[PDB]
Design a protein around this ligand. Structure first.
Ligand SMILES: Nc1c(F)ccc2cnc(-n3ccc4ccncc43)cc12
Ligand SMILES: Nc1c(F)ccc2cnc(-n3ccc4ccncc43)cc12
Ligand SMILES: Nc1c(F)ccc2cnc(-n3ccc4ccncc43)cc12
Ligand SMILES: Nc1c(F)ccc2cnc(-n3ccc4ccncc43)cc12
Ligand SMILES: Nc1c(F)ccc2cnc(-n3ccc4ccncc43)cc12
Ligand SMILES: Nc1c(F)ccc2cnc(-n3ccc4ccncc43)cc12
Lengths: 75, 75, 75, 75, 75, 75
């Protein structure tokens, strides 16, 4: 006989407080990018960037993350 | 005989407070990008960027994330 | 005999408060992009960008995310 | 009695030969300029440029110059 | 009694030959410029540039110069 | 008695020959400039540049110069 009981209990807090958030300046001075390739072959589950001059300002008021995997395998 | 009981309990909080959010300046000075290729072959589940000059200002008032995966496999 | 009971309980909060959100300036100074290719072959589930000069201002008042996957497989 | 005999002689050549002139690429990636002032006071014979993002391609087939000043002053 | 005789003789050559002129690439990656002032006072014979991001391609087939002054002063 | 005889003689050559001129690449990677001032006072015969991010490609097929001052003063 097999009995499997899977009862995780989660009471977690992920939390932040900020009084104020601001006066943020992102002022990048350009630039130059060159890429040479011949053949690209991309297959299962690829994340790729080639030849980029990207500027990102990311200012979340919270920006909190919780990541949670439950896996049960029986054979 | 097999009994499998799967009862995860989740009371999670992902939370934030901000009193004010602002005064954000994103002012990029241009730039230059060149890419050369001959052949691109992309198959299953490819995320790709080639030859980009992208500017992003992302300012969510919260921007909080919960990611929660439940997998039960019986063979 | 097999009994499988799958009863996840979820009371999750994903939440945010912002008193004010604003005074955001996105002012990009142009730029230049060149891409050369000969052949593009894209098959299942491809997300692709080629030769881009994109400006994005994304300011959600919340922008909170919950992603929740339940998979039960019986073979 | 005073005699002034001002007789300059000039058989100068300013000259060029070019067999072919070309394949010229001027390809600038943008940029960003900011100038702050409160007061400008410009008087006689002022040449001024303030806050400029200027692109010039100048390709004369000759572009040769002769500058020649003659000045006789008597008091 | 005074005699002034002023007879410069000029047979000068300023000269060039080029068989071909070309394949010139001017390709600048942007940039960022900021200038702060309060008061500018410019008087006689001022040549001025303030806050500039200038790109120049100058390709004269000759571009030869002769500059020449002939001053006679009698008091 | 005064006799002043001014007879300069000039037979000179300034000269160049080039078989071919080319394959020139000027490719600058941007950059950043900040200047702070309060008062500028400019008077007779001033040549000035303040806060610049300038790119110059200068390719004369000749580019030869002759500068020539003749001056005579009498009292
Ligand atoms: N999620 C993505 C794709 F689907 C494809 C290409 C990517 C390239 N880059 C990032 N990336 C994230 C954070 C970071 C920081 C610095 N550089 C790069 C970064 C994420 C990608
Ligand atoms: N979600 C996406 C696609 F479907 C295809 C291409 C992508 C390229 N890039 C990102 N990416 C995310 C964050 C980050 C940060 C820096 N660079 C790159 C980034 C995401 C992509
Ligand atoms: N969802 C998409 C498509 F269906 C196809 C192409 C894409 C390229 N890019 C992004 N992307 C997202 C975030 C980010 C950040 C930076 N660069 C790139 C990004 C998303 C894409
Ligand atoms: N002739 C002019 C005016 F009447 C007033 C302003 C000027 C500003 N600049 C130039 N100038 C010439 C060549 C060069 C090269 C680089 N930067 C600047 C230049 C000339 C002007
Ligand atoms: N002729 C002019 C004006 F009437 C007023 C401003 C000027 C600023 N600059 C130049 N200039 C010439 C050659 C060079 C090279 C580099 N930087 C600057 C230059 C010339 C000017
Ligand atoms: N002719 C000019 C003006 F009337 C006013 C400003 C100037 C600033 N700069 C130059 N200049 C020439 C050659 C060089 C090389 C490097 N830097 C600077 C240069 C020339 C000017």
């Amino acid at each position: 006989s097999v009995q499997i009981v899977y009862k995780p209990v989660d009471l977690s807090k992920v939390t932040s407080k900020c009084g104020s958030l601001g006066n943020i300046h992102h002022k990048p001075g350009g630039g130059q990018v060159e890429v040479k390739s011949e053949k690209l072959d991309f297959k299962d589950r690829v994340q790729s960037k080639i030849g980029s001059l990207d500027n990102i300002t990311h200012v979340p008021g919270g920006g909190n993350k919780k990541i949670e995997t439950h896996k049960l395998t029986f054979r």
